[PDB]
Amino acid sequence: RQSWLPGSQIPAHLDTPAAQALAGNFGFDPLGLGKDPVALRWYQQAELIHCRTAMAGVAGILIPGLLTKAGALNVPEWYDAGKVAIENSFAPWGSLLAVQLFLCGFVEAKRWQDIRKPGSQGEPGSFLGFEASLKGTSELGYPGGPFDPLGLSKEADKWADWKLKEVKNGRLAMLAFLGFVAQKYATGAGPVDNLAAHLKDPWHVNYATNGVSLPFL
Amino acid sequence: DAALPSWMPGADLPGYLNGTLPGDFGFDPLYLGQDPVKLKWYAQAELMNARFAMLAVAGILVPELLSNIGFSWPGAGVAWYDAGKFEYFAPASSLFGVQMLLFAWVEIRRYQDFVKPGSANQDPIFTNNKLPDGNEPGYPGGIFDPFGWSKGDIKSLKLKEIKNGRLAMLAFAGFIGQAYTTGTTPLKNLSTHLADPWSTTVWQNDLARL
Amino acid sequence: DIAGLTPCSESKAYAKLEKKELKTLEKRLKQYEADSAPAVALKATMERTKARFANYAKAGLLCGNDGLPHLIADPGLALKYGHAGEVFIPTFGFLYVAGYIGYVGRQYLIAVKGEAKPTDKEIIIDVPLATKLAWQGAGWPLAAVQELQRGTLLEKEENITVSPR
Amino acid sequence: KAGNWLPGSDAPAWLPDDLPGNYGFDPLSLGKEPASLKRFTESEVIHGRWAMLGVAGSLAVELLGYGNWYDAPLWAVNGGKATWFGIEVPFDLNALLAFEFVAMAAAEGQRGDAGGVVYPGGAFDPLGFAKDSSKSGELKLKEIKNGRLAMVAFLGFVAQHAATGKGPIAALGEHLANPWGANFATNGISVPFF
Numbered sequence: 169r170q171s172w173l174p175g176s177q178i179p180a181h182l183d184t185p186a187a188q189a190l191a192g193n194f195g196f197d198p199l200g201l202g203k204d205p206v207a208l209r210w211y212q213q214a215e216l217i218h219c220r221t222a223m224a225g226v227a228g229i230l231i232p233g234l235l236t237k238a239g240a241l242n243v244p245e246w247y248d249a250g251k252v253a254i255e256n257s258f259a260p261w262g263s264l265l266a267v268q269l270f271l272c273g274f275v276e277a278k279r280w281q282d283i284r285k286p287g288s289q290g291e292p293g294s295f296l297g298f299e300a301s302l303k304g305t306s307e308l309g310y311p312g313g314p315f316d317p318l319g320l321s322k323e324a325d326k327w328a329d330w331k332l333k334e335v336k337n338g339r340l341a342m343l344a345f346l347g348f349v350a351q352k353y354a355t356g357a358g359p360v361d362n363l364a365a366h367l368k369d370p371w372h373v374n375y376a377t378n379g380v381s382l383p384f385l
Numbered sequence: 386d387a388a389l390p391s392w393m394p395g396a397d398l399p400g401y402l403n404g405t406l407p408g409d410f411g412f413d414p415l416y417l418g419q420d421p422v423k424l425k426w427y428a429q430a431e432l433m434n435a436r437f438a439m440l441a442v443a444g445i446l447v448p449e450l451l452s453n454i455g456f457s458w459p460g461a462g463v464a465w466y467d468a469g470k471f472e473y474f475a476p477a478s479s480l481f482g483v484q485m486l487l488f489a490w491v492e493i494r495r496y497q498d499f500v501k502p503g504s505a506n507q508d509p510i511f512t513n514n515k516l517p518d519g520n521e522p523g524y525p526g527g528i529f530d531p532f533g534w535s536k537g538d539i540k541s542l543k544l545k546e547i548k549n550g551r552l553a554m555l556a557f558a559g560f561i562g563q564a565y566t567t568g569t570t571p572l573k574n575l576s577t578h579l580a581d582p583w584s585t586t587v588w589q590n591d592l593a594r595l
Numbered sequence: 596d597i598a599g600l601t602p603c604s605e606s607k608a609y610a611k612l613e614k615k616e617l618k619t620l621e622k623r624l625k626q627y628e629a630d631s632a633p634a635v636a637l638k639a640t641m642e643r644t645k646a647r648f649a650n651y652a653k654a655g656l657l658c659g660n661d662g663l664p665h666l667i668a669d670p671g672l673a674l675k676y677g678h679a680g681e682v683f684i685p686t687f688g689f690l691y692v693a694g695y696i697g698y699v700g701r702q703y704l705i706a707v708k709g710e711a712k713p714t715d716k717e718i719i720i721d722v723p724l725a726t727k728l729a730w731q732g733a734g735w736p737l738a739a740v741q742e743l744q745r746g747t748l749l750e751k752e753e754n755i756t757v758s759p760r
Numbered sequence: 761k762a763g764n765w766l767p768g769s770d771a772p773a774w775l776p777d778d779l780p781g782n783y784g785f786d787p788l789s790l791g792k793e794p795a796s797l798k799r800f801t802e803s804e805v806i807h808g809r810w811a812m813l814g815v816a817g818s819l820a821v822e823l824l825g826y827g828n829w830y831d832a833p834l835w836a837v838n839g840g841k842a843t844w845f846g847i848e849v850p851f852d853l854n855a856l857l858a859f860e861f862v863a864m865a866a867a868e869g870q871r872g873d874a875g876g877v878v879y880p881g882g883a884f885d886p887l888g889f890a891k892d893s894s895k896s897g898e899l900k901l902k903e904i905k906n907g908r909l910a911m912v913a914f915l916g917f918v919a920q921h922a923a924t925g926k927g928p929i930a931a932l933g934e935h936l937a938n939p940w941g942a943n944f945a946t947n948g949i950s951v952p953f954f
């Protein structure tokens with residue numbers, strides 16, 4: 169049993185067979201927010217969505233940023249790409265955000281109804297015949313059909329491993345984006361610039377010398 | 386856990402490496418091959434990486450070896466890392482697209498035979514042409530072995546293949562390292578080291594840049 | 596700007612008040628030495644006054660005809676003219692700390708209510724349980740929303756005593 | 761079955777063997793339910809017929825010297841009159857949308873009221889090329905295959921136009937003149953790094 173703190177008392181709500189089936193269960197819940205099974209299920213869905221969104225965003229920030237350091241690309245910084253993209257664009261940010269909110273609200277409402285009732289999106293005669301593929305699998309937050317075209321989820325032997333690689337990576341991405349914000353408010357440069365500046369001199373270029381993270385020193 | 390050759394005489398090797406795969410020496414300190422499916426995938430990955438590295442090392446060393454002698458041809462003084470920005474009959478983008486389509490076809494066929502052995506031995510156009518029934522993933526044979534070299538000691542030849550592949554993989558890694566540090570072609574580095582090996586080592590060369 | 600007020604960085608009465616405060620402090624300082632404790636204390640007070648006036652003007656506060664800062668409590672005006680730091684953010688900050696305290700106290704009462712003598716625990720505070728609940732109360736809004744959604748936050752009408760009407 | 765899309769793979773059990781153009785291609789399991797398979801089958805046949813008409817029209821209009829498929833409705837963007845085979849048409853964009861809407865609504869309503877019929881016959885087959893049901897299965901396979909090829913061709917038309925700017929006939933001549941120098945890899949948007 170892997171634990172987030174060797175020797176600490178793992179909470180009872182995270183030791184049940186239902187909670188142990190979740191990917192990345194390390195018994196980490198000091199505030200006890202997952203004591204309620206319904207709340208735990210809802211938070212599991214929230215964590216999965218956060219993991220996938222953070223992975224996509226951090227990838228979209230790191231890969232183009234790393235390619236910009238070399239001569240492969242010329243993508244601006246993540247904190248300035250919005251203005252540059254909206255300058256030579258066909259629509260203002262408000263109209264684009266409205267269209268985005270409508271398109272995202274439709275799929276988010278369908279996902280919400282599936283969370284409230286699993287497999288309820290497969291109601292016949294409701295989505296032009298595509299409702300048959302809108303039914304998720306036996307595990308909430310892991311649907312098939314149009315999603316997962318390669319069919320890598322059909323093999324159970326690697327399934328338990330695959331989920332472990334999705335949550336963990338996602339958690340790392342969730343921290344990465346957080347760092348991307350903090351560094352932006354502490355150095356004023358991009359993440360690749362901060363990485364290069366730290367690699368040039370780690371004993372003097374870190375958060376202990378930025379003058380913000382340690383105001384008492 | 387047997388009399389098979391080991392990478393450390395006397396060490397307690399893991400039990401999942403029983404000598405079935407070629408070149409098994411019980412070398413796995415990180416235990417990356419604990420999962421049988423992961424080990425099955427890593428075997429094919431090692432074979433493919435080894436063969437591509439062998440072709441790469443041969444294609445890096447042969448032009449430089451022929452360039453140092455009287456043999457001459459269009460691309461002679463160009464280094465292996467400088468061959469990309471060379472003037473060819475077609476642009477690099479077109480060649481990249483053509484090779485991506487061709488490699489997509491052969492790689493999907495290889496993957497199909499990997500997930501189902503013997504399911505891709507039949508030629509789609511010519512129904513008469515086919516590979517022999519007895520086959521294993523990563524070892525096609527048939528038209529790929531027209532000389533029938535596999536009819537002899539397949540174990541010894543497989544051991545030779547995996548050993549040469551590992552050596553070529555390390556050689557390609559060394560090519561990248563030498564090109565990034567010395568900034569010169571590998572045979573020139575070999576000649577420089579052979580001129581005076583006592584004063585031309587990795588420690589001396591790297592200390593001169595510190 | 597809002598309500599006919601002017602920014603404190605441009606108000607003449609604001610600068611006049613700053614000059615008046617510095618003038619009375621300097622007048623009091625004129626009777627002491629130059630390297631004594633009252634002189635250093637008065638100089639520190641003067642520097643604090645200058646820093647306070649500069650910080651209030653830098654914050655973008657609106658000053659009235661009296662030269663004193665005026666707060667904006669309307670969320671629309673505060674979010675539209677950059678005044679959310681006056682009454683909005685401190686509102687949510689107080690709500691978080693107040694709900695924190697209330698949730699921790701409620702959890703302690705519910706925890707000690709199932710013991711042999713709850714009144715004894717009410718007069719003699721169980722420090723380990725109180726400390727554990729105080730640390731676990733950081734997620735009070737999420738826990739409170741979950742308790743409200745499950746129906747365990749409130750008590751039924753049949754279990755609460757009432758007067759004979 | 762018509763064949764195997766992936767050699768060595770097993771055909772899905774939800775695809776009937778007598779279905780025209782059944783190559784066993786369904787990795788996403790979209791037609792798993794029988795009710796969805798019927799609608800998708802009719803939709804695929806209708807899409808193939810419309811795509812065949814569209815590709816034939818685009819090829820004919822660009823081969824006859826009357827512009828490409830993209831510049832056809834440009835007359836109603838800057839002021840002009842539509843011309844069919846070099847003959848002027850006095851119908852403006854406003855009268856075209858109304859007549860097309862009424863005609864298409866009536867025809868599609870009549871077609872949909874039959875309960876999703878894919879092969880009506882009778883008035884739609886005056887020559888009687890599919891009178892016997894024995895040869896009907898073979899011709900249906902040709903129809904679905906030509907329709908799939910036309911759908912792929914129309915997608916290629918749109919993609920190549922959005923990538924280069926020229927029409928399908930102009931793109932074919934350029935590729936025939938310089939195959940290595942003119943392809944999808946040299947447009948500048950398909951491959952970003954190169």
Ligand code: CLA
Pocket residue numbers: 552555556558559560561562563566567574575577578585586587590591
């Ligand atoms: C096929 C393996 C191989 C071989 C034969 C060589 C050979 C050589 N390297 Mg090299 N190298 C290698 C791998 C290899 N390297 C790898 C994997 C890296 C990391 C990326 C490097 C990084 C490197 C640098 C930075 C430098 C060299 C340099 C050199 C040259 C002389 C100094 C030296 O030996 O440094 C020491 C080499 C090593 C510490 C590599 C470790 C030993 C490898 C793994 C071989 C294992 C030995 C094995 C029993 C095989 C023996 C040889 C066999 C063919 C008979 C020399 C000709 C120097 C040079 O370029 O000269 C100007 C130089 O500065 N190498």
Ligand code: CLA
Pocket residue numbers: 669670671672673675
């Ligand atoms: C506690 C009681 C309270 C009171 C008395 C007010 C009073 C006021 N609010 Mg308000 N508001 C409140 C709570 C309150 N608010 C809360 C809890 C929120 C958070 C949801 C908001 C968020 C809010 C916004 C975003 C805005 C106001 C605005 C206003 C002013 C005019 C609009 C109005 O009267 O309709 C009642 C307010 C609402 C129903 C909220 C929606 C805003 C309505 C639709 C009007 C907005 C249209 C336009 C901006 C009107 C001004 C036109 C022109 C002068 C620019 C007005 C003095 C508007 C304003 O003057 O901006 C500076 C403004 O846009 N409020």
Ligand code: CLA
Pocket residue numbers: 696697698699700701703704720725728
């Ligand atoms: C567990 C502590 C607790 C909690 C959760 C509440 C909660 C509540 N009280 Mg209450 N109250 C408390 C203690 C508490 N009170 C105490 C100790 C007193 C005696 C001074 C009162 C006297 C009181 C009155 C007279 C009224 C309320 C009212 C209310 C309700 C309106 C919100 C409010 O804050 O009013 C204001 C509450 C206060 C001003 C007193 C709060 C005292 C402190 C901040 C609570 C800390 C308690 C304890 C020391 C901390 C736990 C320690 C533990 C971990 C060991 C609300 C549900 C109102 C009501 O009837 O509902 C509509 C009302 O009229 N309370």
Ligand code: CLA
Pocket residue numbers: 765775779780781782783784785786787789790791797800801802803804807908909911912
């Ligand atoms: C929208 C047109 C369309 C429709 C409705 C169908 C429907 C069907 N096809 Mg078919 N097919 C099509 C186009 C279409 N196809 C094209 C263009 C090709 C050539 C590549 C094929 C080739 C093909 C083969 C080889 C086979 C089928 C088969 C089938 C049947 C199996 C059920 C199924 O797979 O789910 C239903 C399918 C759908 C509901 C289509 C979903 C549409 C998705 C979203 C398209 C995604 C593509 C993407 C958007 C491309 C645009 C790029 C973007 C950036 C703009 C089914 C009735 C199998 C069969 O048994 O034949 C009877 C089979 O063997 N199809």
Ligand SMILES: CC1=C[C@H](O)CC(C)(C)[C@H]1/C=C/C(C)=C/C=C/C(C)=C/C=C/C=C(C)/C=C/C=C(C)/C=C/C1=C(C)C[C@H](O)CC1(C)C
Pocket residue numbers: 196197198199200201218221222224225226228229245246247248249250341342343345346
């Ligand atoms: C568990 C627990 C429980 C216990 O009891 C207690 C405690 C301790 C409290 C805990 C913990 C918690 C935590 C840590 C949390 C965190 C989270 C996060 C961070 C998220 C993020 C998350 C994040 C996310 C999603 C993100 C995303 C991102 C994105 C999209 C991006 C985008 C973009 C791009 C691309 C580029 C451009 O240019 C810009 C932009 C537009 C910007």
Ligand SMILES: CC1=C[C@H](O)CC(C)(C)[C@H]1/C=C/C(C)=C/C=C/C(C)=C/C=C/C=C(C)/C=C/C=C(C)/C=C/C1=C(C)C[C@H](O)CC1(C)C
Pocket residue numbers: 785786787788789790807808810811813814815817818828829830832833910911912914915
């Ligand atoms: C099967 C499946 C299932 C599994 O499971 C999965 C997946 C993979 C998803 C799948 C696949 C899918 C696909 C491929 C799809 C596609 C489709 C298409 C392409 C369509 C088109 C389609 C197309 C179409 C109709 C088209 C049409 C066209 C037209 C009309 C045209 C017209 C015209 C012309 C004449 C010319 C002029 O100048 C203009 C106009 C007037 C404009």
Ligand SMILES: CC1=C(/C=C/C(C)=C/C=C/C(C)=C\C=C\C=C(C)\C=C\C=C(C)\C=C\C2=C(C)C[C@H](O)CC2(C)C)C(C)(C)CCC1
Pocket residue numbers: 668669670682683686693694695696697698701739
């Ligand atoms: C979770 C919690 C506690 C429970 C608290 C409960 C049960 C609260 C219930 C409240 C109920 C039933 C109704 C509340 C209605 C609230 C209303 C009508 C207030 C609306 C707000 C308005 C009109 C505007 C406010 C303002 C905004 C947002 C920003 C600025 O403040 C300025 C201003 C005034 C405009 C327990 C158990 C004591 C434990 C501990 C914390």
